[PDB]
Symmetry: C3
Subunit: 30 residues, 3 copies
């Protein structure tokens, strides 16, 4: 369970940062 | 298993939406 | 464990590719 939870959280964090950078680019292309 | 599967699916959904927004921005920057 | 690990890795790969495309768009909007 716990190492798998660690891997999922690493992906959750990568997704978080990507979502912010996508939003930044969305604003610039507007 | 099942709560972990729930978390993975939440990430799969976030990735799905991000992929669509990235494609949108890709088209605009072309 | 193993099928769940497979699903996590599929997400890790999708995130990898999205990160590269986001970087590409970031450079173009600069």
């Amino acid at each position: 369970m716990k190492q798998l939870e660690d891997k999922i959280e690493e992906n959750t964090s990568k997704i978080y940062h990507n979502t912010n950078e996508i939003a930044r680019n969305t604003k610039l292309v507007g």
